[PDB]
Structure formats: structure tokens, C-alpha cells
Amino acid sequence: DLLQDIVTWDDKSLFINGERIMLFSGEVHPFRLPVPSLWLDIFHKIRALGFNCVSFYIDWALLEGKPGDYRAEGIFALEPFFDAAKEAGIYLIARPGSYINAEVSGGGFPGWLQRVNGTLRSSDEPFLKATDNYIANAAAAVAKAQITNGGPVILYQPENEYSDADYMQYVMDQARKADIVVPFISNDASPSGHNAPGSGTGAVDIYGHDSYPLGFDCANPSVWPEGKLPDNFRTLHLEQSPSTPYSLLEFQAGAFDPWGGPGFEKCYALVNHEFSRVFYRNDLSFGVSTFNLYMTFGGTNWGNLGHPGGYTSYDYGSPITETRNVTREKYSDIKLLANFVKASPSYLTATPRNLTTGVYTDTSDLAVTPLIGDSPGSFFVVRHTDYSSQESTSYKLKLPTSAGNLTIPQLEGTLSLNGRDSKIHVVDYNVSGTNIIYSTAEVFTWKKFDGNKVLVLYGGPKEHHELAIASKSNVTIIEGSDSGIVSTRKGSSVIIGWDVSSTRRIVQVGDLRVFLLDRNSAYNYWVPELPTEGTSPGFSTSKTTASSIIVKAGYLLRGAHLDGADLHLTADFNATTPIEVIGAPTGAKNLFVNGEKASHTVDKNGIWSSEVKYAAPEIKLPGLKDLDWKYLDTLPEIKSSYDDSAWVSADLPKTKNTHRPLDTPTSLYSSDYGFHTGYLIYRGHFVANGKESEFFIRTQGGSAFGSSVWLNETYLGSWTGADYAMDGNSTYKLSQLESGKNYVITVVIDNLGLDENWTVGEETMKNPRGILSYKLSGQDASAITWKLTGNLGGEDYQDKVRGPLNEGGLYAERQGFHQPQPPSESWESGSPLEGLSKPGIGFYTAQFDLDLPKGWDVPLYFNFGNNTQAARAQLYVNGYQYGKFTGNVGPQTSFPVPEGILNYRGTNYVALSLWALESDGAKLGSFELSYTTPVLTGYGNVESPEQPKYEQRKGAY
Numbered sequence: 001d002l003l004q005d006i007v008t009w010d011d012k013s014l015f016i017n018g019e020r021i022m023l024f025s026g027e028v029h030p031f032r033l034p035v036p037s038l039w040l041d042i043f044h045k046i047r048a049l050g051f052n053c054v055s056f057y058i059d060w061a062l063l064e065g066k067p068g069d070y071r072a073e074g075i076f077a078l079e080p081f082f083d084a085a086k087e088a089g090i091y092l093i094a095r096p097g098s099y100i101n102a103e104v105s106g107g108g109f110p111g112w113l114q115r116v117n118g119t120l121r122s123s124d125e126p127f128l129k130a131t132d133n134y135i136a137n138a139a140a141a142v143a144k145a146q147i148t149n150g151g152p153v154i155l156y157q158p159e160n161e162y163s164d165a166d167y168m169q170y171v172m173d174q175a176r177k178a179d180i181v182v183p184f185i186s187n188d189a190s191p192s193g194h195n196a197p198g199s200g201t202g203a204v205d206i207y208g209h210d211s212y213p214l215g216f217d218c219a220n221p222s223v224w225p226e227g228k229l230p231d232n233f234r235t236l237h238l239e240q241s242p243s244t245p246y247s248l249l250e251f252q253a254g255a256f257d258p259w260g261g262p263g264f265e266k267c268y269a270l271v272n273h274e275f276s277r278v279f280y281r282n283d284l285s286f287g288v289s290t291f292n293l294y295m296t297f298g299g300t301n302w303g304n305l306g307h308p309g310g311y312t313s314y315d316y317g318s319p320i321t322e323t324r325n326v327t328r329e330k331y332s333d334i335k336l337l338a339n340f341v342k343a344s345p346s347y348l349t350a351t352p353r354n355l356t357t358g359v360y361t362d363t364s365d366l367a368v369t370p371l372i373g374d375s376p377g378s379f380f381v382v383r384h385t386d387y388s389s390q391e392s393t394s395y396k397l398k399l400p401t402s403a404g405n406l407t408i409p410q411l412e413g414t415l416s417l418n419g420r421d422s423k424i425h426v427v428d429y430n431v432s433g434t435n436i437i438y439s440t441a442e443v444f445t446w447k448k449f450d451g452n453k454v455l456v457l458y459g460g461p462k463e464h465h466e467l468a469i470a471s472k473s474n475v476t477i478i479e480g481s482d483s484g485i486v487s488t489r490k491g492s493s494v495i496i497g498w499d500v501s502s503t504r505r506i507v508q509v510g511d512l513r514v515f516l517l518d519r520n521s522a523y524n525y526w527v528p529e530l531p532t533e534g535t536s537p538g539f540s541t542s543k544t545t546a547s548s549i550i551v552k553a554g555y556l557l558r559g560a561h562l563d564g565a566d567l568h569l570t571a572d573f574n575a576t577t578p579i580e581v582i583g584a585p586t587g588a589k590n591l592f593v594n595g596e597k598a599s600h601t602v603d604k605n606g607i608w609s610s611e612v613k614y615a616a617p618e619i620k621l622p623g624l625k626d627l628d629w630k631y632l633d634t635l636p637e638i639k640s641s642y643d644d645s646a647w648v649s650a651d652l653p654k655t656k657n658t659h660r661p662l663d664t665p666t667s668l669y670s671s672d673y674g675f676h677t678g679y680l681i682y683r684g685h686f687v688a689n690g691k692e693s694e695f696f697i698r699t700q701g702g703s704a705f706g707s708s709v710w711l712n713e714t715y716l717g718s719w720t721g722a723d724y725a726m727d728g729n730s731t732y733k734l735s736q737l738e739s740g741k742n743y744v745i746t747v748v749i750d751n752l753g754l755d756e757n758w759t760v761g762e763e764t765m766k767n768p769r770g771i772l773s774y775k776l777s778g779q780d781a782s783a784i785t786w787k788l789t790g791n792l793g794g795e796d797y798q799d800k801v802r803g804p805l806n807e808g809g810l811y812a813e814r815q816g817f818h819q820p821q822p823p824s825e826s827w828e829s830g831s832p833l834e835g836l837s838k839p840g841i842g843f844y845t846a847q848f849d850l851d852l853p854k855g856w857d858v859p860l861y862f863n864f865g866n867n868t869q870a871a872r873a874q875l876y877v878n879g880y881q882y883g884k885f886t887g888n889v890g891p892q893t894s895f896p897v898p899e900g901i902l903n904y905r906g907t908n909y910v911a912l913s914l915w916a917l918e919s920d921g922a923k924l925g926s927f928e929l930s931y932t933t934p935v936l937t938g939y940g941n942v943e944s945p946e947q948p949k950y951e952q953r954k955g956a957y
């Protein structure tokens with residue numbers, strides 16, 4: 001099943017053009033950042049981690065909202081994404097579904113799948129047909145960008161965590177029919193060998209699996225439960241698919257968070273820099289060669305794209321935050337590790353062995369997994385045997401090296417593993433022809449700078465280390481004091497011992513310079529490739545790795561290029577930053593930073609030295625309470641003057657849903673009528689008979705939904721909402737009705753997205769939204785005839801620019817008043833801070849200017865006070881819905897919105913719906929716009945995507 005000659009493989013790793021590669025990869029979802037001109041930003045930050053690969057989903061639900069009309073342009077265009085990857089020199093793994101899970105509405109499935117007469121994710125002909133147009137279009141786009149045409153796409157994942165075997169095979173043939181030629185890779189939810197090579201029909205080319213050892217309950221970030229760290233993955237691999245290279249297609253890099261959850265902060269505090277350093281070195285101990293972190297950039301579930309088991313934010317506690325910042329320590333810690341892999345090709349050939357206790361150390365409190373292959377060059381991964389230990393452990397190593405079984409340290413001192421940490425010790429490590437016999441401190445990187453070799457080593461604080469070099473030369477200390485450093489010669493080797501310190505030492509041994517850093521100073525180093533024509537580094541290759549330089553900076557280094565005699569750095573800064581360039585080429589004479597000539601200095605050792613001053617600019621943000629807010633009633637349906645005669649009639653005698661038969665005379669399932677997204681409104685018309693006393697109603701909006709009911713203009717009550725309840729049972733009492741008169745029951749229902757469909761055969765995505773059942777006491781159910789609406793036009797959705805999910809069924813949304821320049825001068829003055837005095841729903845509108853300085857990346861947030869009322873709000877920024885706030889469920893109160901969506905030197909239109917589900921009415925406790933550290937950026941101009949303004953819609957009601 002090999003079908004091209006560019007990407008091949010053996011049992012050890014992939015090859016790209018006959019050369020081994022370790023794919024260190026990050027998950028990014030373009031649809032979760034609707035600003036195409038910011039995608040390159042994400043790639044820069046991932047390449048700067050030392051990654052060479054990105055993994056991404058395509059969301060069917062946003063691309064074919066209307067059946068038969070595939071649409072992937074503007075903010076949903078796939079091409080600028082592929083271009084950005086190419087520009088940053090990042091390979092892509094494409095995971096198009098058609099089912100993607102991803103914590104998005106429907107797990108990727110459009111709402112109209114609720115009308116399809118076949119089992120989802122099965123070889124049922126109607127379901128296969130339903131996916132045909134989507135895959136023929138999406139996979140075609142992926143095909144043009146394959147590496148066989150010089151694009152970045154090197155692999156393709158069919159489906160997602162699957163389990164007929166027939167179904168899998170079909171999805172593969174379906175992609176092959178669209179010219180996908182690259183190898184197929186799988187993502188088994190657990191390591192069970194599902195669909196591995198040899199499993200019959202549906203077998204992929206390369207077996208891959210997932211793992212999230214700590215799960216997703218972020219409630220107790222400091223606690224790592226016993227026995228959760230996997231230790232058998234390399235054994236399982238050899239049993240399940242030894243012919244293909246070991247592959248982790250999703251490994252934990254954060255966690256998702258449900259409505260009513262602890263928040264992504266605690267999620268980060270659980271999956272922090274200790275998690276990464278311990279767990280990721282653990283994955284290297286299995287000899288993983290394709291290794292993707294889910295998520296490495298989370299983004300935002302803007303425009304209702306998310307599923308009910310999650311809220312607006314998808315920060316995920318990821319290495320790169322929702323606001324795209326790289327402050328988290330996990331980021332800097334991942335960078336140390338990825339740079340070691342990038343610099344260490346012998347890692348791929350160093351065959352993994354069973355883990356050991358008490359063999360390579362005296363203690364059994366440590367576990368050691370050796371990586372030893374057919375040729376010299378080995379690695380020993382060390383961690384506490386109980387991975388959760390906070391203990392600080394002292395130990396000595398007995399390692400087998402080319403100079404014999406050595407006991408280390410050979411000179412003074414002891415090694416330390418302090419708490420939740422892990423080390424990769426190297427033996428017979430080749431630095432360009434110089435053999436490092438061993439080194440206990442970890443490798444960051446090494447380069448040959450044509451004549452002189454540089455090796456960068458680091459350890460954590462208060463640690464002692466040693467290394468040995470096969471060398472005849474003497475040992476000189478060319479920077480720092482010899483305080484704490486001892487050396488001696490033993491035959492044809494040179495042994496060096498040292499204490500970790502916050503001040504760098506550099507030691508020279510012949511033509512080899514060894515940098516000795518502490519972990520926290522190594523955090524500030526970068527290893528960018530140095531292209532000599534153009535500013536793009538190109539894809540990752542051993543030749544491009546070989547001609548990289550070492551740079552000490554601060555917040556971020558995007559890249560570097562050599563323009564004749566000018567050395568260019570492209571960087572971001574969040575503080576005054578000392579810069580150092582190590583390994584500048586001999587022709588280089590001048591330093592440029594972000595296109596500006598910068599003064600520099602050369603020391604006795606030929607290291608370049610410069611500085612960039614940081615001075616926070618003044619940031620003027622309007623106070624939101626001071627704005628000229630306009631109020632509009634966006635539930636005019638609960639006034640007796642409203643005419644619903646244009647509404648669709650809910651009069652289907654049979655549902656097309658195969659998963660939940662009706663309990664009502666007609667279908668009140670919203671997807672039967674093409675409404676899948678946003679708030680839903682139902683209207684039940686009946687003639688009274690004077691015998692009515694109670695009205696019972698079961699509503700369903702997905703977990704954490706609310707609903708409110710009126711009889712004519714009289715409020716009956718609300719299902720207030722909770723995190724566990726996907727549905728709600730409500731009984732309301734009725735004082736006597738006027739026999740013979742018309743009455744209308746109005747029901748408003750929050751829809752928080754459609755379910756995923758994780759278990760094949762269970763059909764949970766077909767869980768309907770709307771009214772499940774009802775009983776009007778003293779009346780026959782068929783006496784009530786219903787109208788309903790969701791978003792105007794249903795599947796004939798109005799906003800092509802913002803996609804089929806962005807706007808819901810509120811009156812203001814049906815008219816398009818959430819868009820720029822609403823017709824609001826005629827509206828009443830009213831702030832959401834004053835709010836409503838009775839149940840109902842208000843719509844609030846205002847505009848403000850921003851005038852933020854060019855050259856600065858500044859995260860902006862909408863902040864909501866929490867007064868704990870049962871109130872629901874939707875935020876819109878220039879037409880884009882960027883927040884669902886619910887005061888009695890939580891936890892989100894701060895809502896970031898990216899530049900592009902916000903206009904930083906122009907006008908912005910904010911809109912806000914406020915729904916009161918309590919009889920006293922409701923208000924916002926506070927509503928402030930805030931910011932966090934302004935970053936001096938070397939990124940270019942951020943272009944806004946289309947922000948279509950308000951315009952009168954044909955047939956709005």
C-alpha cells in the first residue's frame with residue numbers, strides 16, 4: 001500500500017526523500033481561529049519550539065451547512081493554511097474525518113445528518129452517500145497540497161478513533177479517489193491494534209494511537225494519582241504493529257473543560273511543565289518517532305462551533321494559549337526537549353529496551369529505560385519509579401560505554417533527580433566527529449560552526465553533573481569562574497564535573513566548546529535555521545538543521561536569515577532583552593533586529609552581543625460602561641401583537657430521526673426542519689376549553705442548556721440549567737383560561753451544540769434539540785399546533801461569511817442586527833449593566849474606536865462580572881459571536897477576542913443578548929474590556945477578515 005516514493009518508512013521511523021525524520025508535531029485547528037492572517041503566527045511559534053510538523057482537523061459541519069453546497073472560503077479557506085505551513089517550513093498531517101470528535105458540534109457532523117436514514121459511522125449506504133460531497137471537496141484540497149506536488153501534507157488520517165471494517169475501507173478508498181497518495185495513519189483511542197496493518201479490511205498504512213494518562217478532571221492540579229504513567233507502550237507496540245514506526249497521534253498537552261468545570265488555569269496547572277518533561281521523555285523511552293501534542297494551540301469555540309460538553313474557550317491549558325501567547329513554562333520546557341530530538345539523529349536508531357530498576361542505578365526508586373542500537377550511541381531515560389514522587393533523589397549511574405562500564409560521577413559528587421523531573425543521559429554521543437563518552441546533563445543542541453563545535457548542556461537547579469570527552473586536548477574555562485568545576489584526564493579521555501549555576505560557564509576542549517547552563521536560562525535559547533536566500537527556512541532537513549545558529553533572546557525568536565553580510569533576527573519581546581548570537585558565519589558583519597540595524601559587540605570568544613529595550617506603550621481602552629448603549633427587545637414573540645404566520649410549521653407526522661421516535665403528535669425536533677444552531681423558539685397555538693390547570697414540557701438543548709416559557713404574555717417559569725442536564729422536565733401551574741379564546745405558548749431553548757458520536761452504533765449525535773414531549777392538562781396534545789424557528793433560512797443560512805453556525809434564532813439575529821452598523825439610532829438607551837426587570841431577552845448594541853500602536857501584539861478580553869443570577873448572554877464582535885456567558889453555570893468570565901476580529905486602529909461594533917431566566921429580571925454585574933502584557937512583535941500587519949455590515953434581509957420575521 002505504498003503509493004509514492006517521497007514518504008516511506010521502516011520499523012524505526014518515517015523517511016522523507018530517503019532520509020529519516022522524527023516528526024515532533026502539534027495540533028492546530030484553523031477553524032478555531034477565524035483570522036487567516038494570524039495562522040502564520042501559530043506556525044512560527046510551533047517551529048520555534050523545535051517542531052517540524054502540525055496536525056489538523058477539518059470540520060465538516062462548518063463547510064457544508066447546507067446539504068450539497070460545499071463552501072470553504074474566507075475564514076474557512078484551506079489554502080492559506082497550507083501556504084502558511086509551507087512558508088514556515090512545517091509538514092502537515094491532515095485529519096479530515098468525516099467524523100473528527102474534536103469537542104466540536106456534532107463531532108464534525110452537520111445537523112442535517114439527523115435526517116439521514118442510516119447508522120452513523122457505518123457502511124450503511126445512506127450514511128456513506130451523505131459524506132461523499134464533503135470528502136470529494138475537502139480531500140481534493142488536501143491533495144493539491146501533498147508533498148508529492150511540493151506541498152506540506154505528508155500524512156493522512158482517515159476517520160477518528162474508530163471502534164463494520166467495511167466502513168473504514170470505504171473512507172480510505174474515498175480519499176484515494178480524491179488523489180490522496182500519501183500514507184494513511186490511524187489514531188486508536190487506546191493501544192489495542194484497531195485497524196493496524198494486518199487487521200484485514202480497513203487496515204491503515206501506519207498504526208497510531210492516542211493517550212491522555214491524566215484524563216480531563218482538572219479539579220486537583222497538584223495531584224498525580226498512582227499508576228497513571230504508561231510503562232508498557234513499547235511492549236504493546238511490538239505486539240500490535242512491529243512493522244511500522246511507533247506513533248502517538250495525540251498525546252496529552254492539556255485538557256478540555258466542560259460547562260461548570262474548574263477552568264483552563266487548573267487544566268494548565270495539572271498538565272504543566274513537569275508533566276511535559278516527565279511524560280514526554282517517557283514517550284521517547286518507547287522510541288516514538290511520530291509524536292503529536294493535542295492541543296498545542298487551542299483557540300476558541302466561537303460561533304457555536306463547539307459541542308455541549310464544552311464552553312466558548314478552547315484554551316485547553318495548551319503550550320500556546322488562547323490569546324496565542326507563549327508565557328507558560330510548559331512551552332519553554334517542551335522547547336528544550338524538541339531541540340534535543342532535532343539535534344540527535346541517533347535517537348531513531350537507538351533501539352528501546354525494557355525498563356529497569358536497580359540495574360543502572362543503585363536505587364530501585366528510579367527507573368531507567370535504556371535506548372541501545374546496533375552501533376555506538378545510546379540514551380538512558382531516568383525518572384522516579386513512582387512517577388508522581390515529589391522526592392528529591394540522589395544517585396549514581398553505572399553505564400556501559402565505549403570506554404567500558406563506568407560509574408558516574410567518576411570524580412566528586414552525586415547526581416540528583418528533584419521531584420517531578422526526568423533526564424535523558426547520553427552515552428557515546430557524536431558531536432560532529434568528536435565523541436562525548438557520556439554526559440549526565442541533558443543536551444539542548446550542538447552545531448559545527450565550521451572549525452569550532454558547540455555543545456549546549458543544561459541541568460535543573462542545585463544539581464551536580466559530569467561529562468567525558470574522547471580527546472587528547474587540555475581543558476580551558478573561557479567564560480565564568482572555575483568555581484565548582486573539576487577536571488582530570490583518564491587515559492585518552494577528559495573528564496569534567498560541574499555544579500549547575502545561574503551564571504553560564506563555557507569550557508573549551510580542543511575545537512569543542514561546551515556551554516553549561518541552568519534550566520531556566522536555557523529556556524531563553526533558540527536554534528533557528530539560517531537561510532541564505534529568502535526568509536523562509538524551508539522544510540526540516542538534516543542540511544537545514546546543520547546550518548542553524550544558536551541565539552539567546554527572550555520571549556520569542558521567529559527566525560533568522562543571512563542577507564550577504566547582514567545577520568537578521570526576527571523576534572518578539574515582552575521585557576528588556578539581552579541578545580547573543582552564537583555561531584555567526586564568517587561573512588557576517590552586521591546585526592539587524594526586526595528590520596532595524598542594531599548595535600552589537602563581539603567578545604573574546606567571538607559571541608555577538610546586543611540588547612533590545614522594552615517600554616510598555618500607553619494602552620487606551622474605552623470603559624464599556626461609559627459607551628452609548630442601545631437596547632432592543634429581542635423577544636417580541638411574547639407580546640400579543642406578534643405575527644408568526646411566516647414561521648415554518650412544525651407539522652411533520654413522522655420524524656426522520658432514526659434514533660428517537662416521537663412522543664408528540666408532530667416532530668418538534670429542530671433538525672427535522674433544518675435548524676441546528678443557536679437559540680430556538682417554539683410557538684404552540686391552541687383554543688382554550690377552560691379545563692386546563694397544568695402545562696408539562698420536556699425540553700432539550702444539550703448539557704447546561706436553559707429554557708423559558710410564556711403563556712401569551714404571562715411568564716410560567718424557566719429550566720434554569722445545570723452542567724449534567726442535557727434535557728429538562730418542567731411542570732407549570734395555570735390559573736384558569738378563558739374558554740374559547742386563542743392562546744399561544746412560547747418556548748425559548750438554548751442549544752449548546754449537537755453531541756459527538758464517540759461510540760459507533762450508539763448514535764448520540766442524533767440526540768434532537770427542541771421539545772421532547774408535553775402535556776396540556778385537560779386538553780388533547782394534538783389540540784396544540786406548533787411553529788418553530790432557529791437561524792433565519794435554516795440550512796439556507798444567511799451569513800456565508802461567518803458560516804452556518806454563527807447566528808441563532810433570536811429576532812435580533814434573524815434581522816442581522818448583531819452585525820456592524822446596526823439600525824440602532826431609533827433604539828432606546830439602555831445598558832446591559834442595568835439590564836432587565838422581568839423575564840425576557842434584551843439586545844444591546846454599541847460601537848467604540850480603538851487606536852492601538854502598530855508593532856505591538858496585545859491580548860484583549862471582554863470581562864463579565866459574576867452576580868450569580870440565572871442569566872445567559874451572547875457576545876458579538878463585529879458580527880462574530882465570541883462568547884456564551886451563563887451566570888449560574890460558569891466558569892467562563894473572561895472572553896478573549898483576537899486582532900482581526902477586533903479592529904485595532906478603527907471602529908468596532910459590539911452586540912450583546914441578555915436573557916433573564918428569573919422573575920426579578922437580570923443584569924451584568926460589570927462589563928470591562930481589559931488587556932495583558934503588550935508584546936513588541938516582529939510579525940507583520942494583521943489583516944482583518946470580512947466583517948459584513950447589517951443589511952435588511954429578504955423575508956426576515
Ligand SMILES: *[C@@H]1O[C@H](CO)[C@@H](O[C@@H]2O[C@H](CO)[C@@H](O[C@@H]3O[C@H](CO[C@H]4O[C@H](CO[C@H]5O[C@H](CO)[C@@H](O)[C@H](O)[C@@H]5O)[C@@H](O)[C@H](O[C@H]5O[C@H](CO)[C@@H](O)[C@H](O)[C@@H]5O)[C@@H]4O)[C@@H](O)[C@H](O[C@H]4O[C@H](CO[C@H]5O[C@H](CO)[C@@H](O)[C@H](O)[C@@H]5O)[C@@H](O)[C@H](O)[C@@H]4O[C@H]4O[C@H](CO)[C@@H](O)[C@H](O)[C@@H]4O[C@H]4O[C@H](CO)[C@@H](O)[C@H](O)[C@@H]4O)[C@@H]3O)[C@H](O)[C@H]2NC(C)=O)[C@H](O)[C@H]1NC(C)=O
Nearest residue numbers: 219258260261262722723724866868887888889890891892
Ligand atoms: C458565578 O458564581 C456562581 C456561584 O459561585 C456559580 O454558580 C455555581 O456554578 C456551579 C458550577 O456549575 C454549580 O455547581 C454545579 O451544580 C450542578 C447542579 O446541581 C444540581 O443538580 C444535581 C441534580 O442531579 C442529581 O439529581 C437529579 C434529580 O434531582 C438526577 O436526575 C441526576 O442525574 C442527579 O442524581 C444535584 O446533584 C444538585 O443537588 C445539590 O443541591 C441541592 C439543593 O441545594 C441539594 O438538595 C442536593 O442534595 C445537592 O446538595 C443540584 O440539585 C452539579 O451537577 C454540579 O456538580 C458537579 O460538580 C460538583 C463539584 O463542583 C465543584 O467543584 C468543581 C470541580 O470539581 C467546580 O468546577 C465547580 O464549579 C464546583 O466548585 C460535584 O460535586 C458533582 O459530582 C459534579 O461533578 C462533575 O463535574 C465536576 C466539575 O466539572 C467534575 O470535576 C466531576 O468529575 C464531575 O464531572 C462529571 O460529570 C459532569 C456533569 O456533572 C460532566 O460534565 C463531566 O465531564 C463528568 O462526566 C455542580 O455542583 C452551582 O450550582 C452554581 N451555584 C449557584 C449558586 O448557582 C457560577 O458558575 C459562576 N458563573 C460564572 C460565569 O463563572
Ligand SMILES: CC(=O)N[C@H]1[C@H](O[C@H]2[C@H](O)[C@H](O)[C@H](O[C@H]3[C@H](O)[C@@H](CO)O[C@@H](O[C@H]4[C@H](O)[C@H](O)[C@H](O[C@H]5[C@H](O)[C@@H](CO)O[C@@H](O[C@H]6[C@H](O)[C@H](O)[C@H](O[C@H]7[C@H](O)[C@@H](CO)O[C@@H](O[C@H]8[C@H](O)[C@H](O)[C@H](O[C@H]9[C@H](O)[C@H](O)[C@H](O)O[C@@H]9CO)O[C@@H]8CO)[C@@H]7NC(C)=O)O[C@@H]6CO)[C@@H]5NC(C)=O)O[C@@H]4COP(=O)(O)O)[C@@H]3NC(C)=O)O[C@@H]2CO)O[C@H](CO)[C@@H](O)[C@@H]1O
Nearest residue numbers: 037040073074077079080083084087535570800801938940
Ligand atoms: C519580501 C519581503 O518583504 N520579505 C520580508 C518578510 O515578509 C514576509 C511576510 O511575513 C508575509 O507573511 C509573507 O507570507 C506570504 C507568502 O509569501 C505568500 C506565498 O506566496 O502567501 C501569503 O498570503 C497569501 C495567502 O496565502 C492567500 O494566497 C491570499 O490570497 C488572497 C488574496 O490576497 C485576496 C485578495 O483580495 O483574495 C483572497 O480571496 C478572497 C477573495 O478576495 C474573494 O472576494 C472572496 O470573497 C468571497 C467570500 O469569502 C465568500 C464567503 O463565503 O462569499 C463569496 O460570495 C458568495 C456569496 O456569499 C453568495 O451568496 C453566493 O451564493 C450563491 C452561490 O454562489 C450560487 O451561485 C447559488 O446559485 O446562489 C447562492 C446564493 O446564496 O456564493 C458566493 C460564492 O462566491 C465571496 N465572493 C464574492 C465573489 O463576493 O474571499 C476570498 C477568500 O477565499 C485570497 N485568498 C484566497 C484563499 O484565495 O494572499 C495572501 C498574500 O497577501 P499579501 O500579498 O497582502 O501579503 C503570505 N502572507 C501571509 C499574511 O501569510 O512572507 C513574506 C516573505 O516575503 O518578512 C521577513 C521576516 O520579518 C522580512 O525579514 C522580509 O524582508
Ligand SMILES: *[C@@H]1O[C@H](CO)[C@@H](O[C@@H]2O[C@H](CO)[C@@H](O[C@@H]3O[C@H](CO[C@H]4O[C@H](CO)[C@@H](O)[C@H](O[C@H]5O[C@H](CO)[C@@H](O)[C@H](O)[C@@H]5O)[C@@H]4O)[C@@H](O)[C@H](O[C@H]4O[C@H](CO)[C@@H](O)[C@H](O)[C@@H]4O[C@H]4O[C@H](CO)[C@@H](O)[C@H](O)[C@@H]4O)[C@@H]3O)[C@H](O)[C@H]2NC(C)=O)[C@H](O)[C@H]1NC(C)=O
Nearest residue numbers: 222268269272274326327328329332520523554555574933
Ligand atoms: C514574558 O514572557 C516570559 C516567557 O518568555 C514569561 O516568563 C514565564 O513566566 C511564567 C509565569 O507566568 C513562569 O512560570 C512560573 O514560574 C514559577 C516558578 O519559578 C520558576 O523559576 C524559578 C526561578 O526563578 C525556579 O526556581 C522554578 O523552578 C522550581 O519550581 C518548579 C515549580 O515548582 C519546579 O518544577 C522545579 O523543579 C524547580 O524546583 C520555576 O522554574 C512557578 O511558580 C509557576 O508555577 C506555578 O504555577 C503553575 C501554574 O500556574 C503550576 O503548574 C506550578 O506547579 C507552580 O505552582 C506551584 O506553586 C503553587 C502556588 O501557586 C502551588 O499551588 C503548586 O503546588 C506549585 O508548587 C510558573 O511555572 C515561567 O518560568 C517564565 N518563563 C521564563 C522563560 O522566564 C513572563 O511571565 C513574561 N512577562 C510578562 C510581564 O508577561
Ligand SMILES: *[C@@H]1O[C@H](CO)[C@@H](O[C@@H]2O[C@H](CO)[C@@H](O[C@@H]3O[C@H](CO)[C@@H](O)[C@H](O[C@H]4O[C@H](CO)[C@@H](O)[C@H](O)[C@@H]4O[C@H]4O[C@H](CO)[C@@H](O)[C@H](O)[C@@H]4O)[C@@H]3O)[C@H](O)[C@H]2NC(C)=O)[C@H](O)[C@H]1NC(C)=O
Nearest residue numbers: 264265315321322323325327859863894926928930932933
Ligand atoms: C496568556 O494567555 C492566557 C490565556 O489566554 C491569559 O490568561 C487569562 O488572563 C485573563 C486576563 O488576565 C484571566 O482573566 C482574569 O483572571 C483573574 C483571576 O481569576 C481575574 O481576577 C480577572 O478578572 C477581574 O479583573 C478584570 C480586570 O483585570 C476585571 O475586568 C474583572 O471584572 C475582574 O474584576 C476583579 O476586580 C474587581 C475589582 O477590582 C472585583 O470586583 C472582582 O471580583 C475581581 O477581583 C480576569 O478574569 C483569565 O483567567 C486567563 N484565562 C485563562 C484561560 O488562562 C494570560 O493573561 C496571557 N498572558 C499574557 C502575559 O498576556
Ligand SMILES: *[C@@H]1O[C@H](CO)[C@@H](O[C@@H]2O[C@H](CO)[C@@H](O)[C@H](O)[C@H]2NC(C)=O)[C@H](O)[C@H]1NC(C)=O
Nearest residue numbers: 639640641642643644712713738741742743744
Ligand atoms: C393570546 O395571544 C394571541 C396572539 O398571540 C391573541 O390572538 C388574537 O386573538 C384575536 C381574537 O381571537 C384575533 O382576532 C387576532 O388575530 C389574534 N392575534 C393574532 C396575532 O393571532 C389572543 O387574543 C390572546 N388571548 C387572550 C385570551 O388574551
Ligand SMILES: *[C@@H]1O[C@H](CO)[C@@H](O[C@@H]2O[C@H](CO)[C@@H](O)[C@H](O)[C@H]2NC(C)=O)[C@H](O)[C@H]1NC(C)=O
Nearest residue numbers: 663698699722724725726727728729730772773
Ligand atoms: C426527565 O424525565 C425523564 C423521565 O420522564 C428522565 O428520563 C429517564 O431517565 C431514567 C434514568 O436516567 C431512564 O432509565 C428512563 O428511561 C428515562 N425515561 C424516559 C421516558 O426517558 C430524565 O432523566 C429527566 N430529565 C432530567 C434532567 O431529570
Ligand SMILES: *[C@@H]1O[C@H](CO)[C@@H](O)[C@H](O)[C@H]1NC(C)=O
Nearest residue numbers: 231232233235354355356357
Ligand atoms: C519491563 O518493563 C515492565 C513495564 O513494561 C516492568 O514492569 C518490568 O519490571 C520490566 N522488566 C524488567 C526487565 O525489570
Ligand SMILES: OC[C@H]1O[C@@H](O)[C@H](O)[C@@H](O)[C@H]1O
Nearest residue numbers: 100101102103161210250256
Ligand atoms: O480533547 C480530547 C481529544 O480526545 C482524542 O482522543 C480525540 O481523538 C480528539 O478528537 C479529542 O476529542
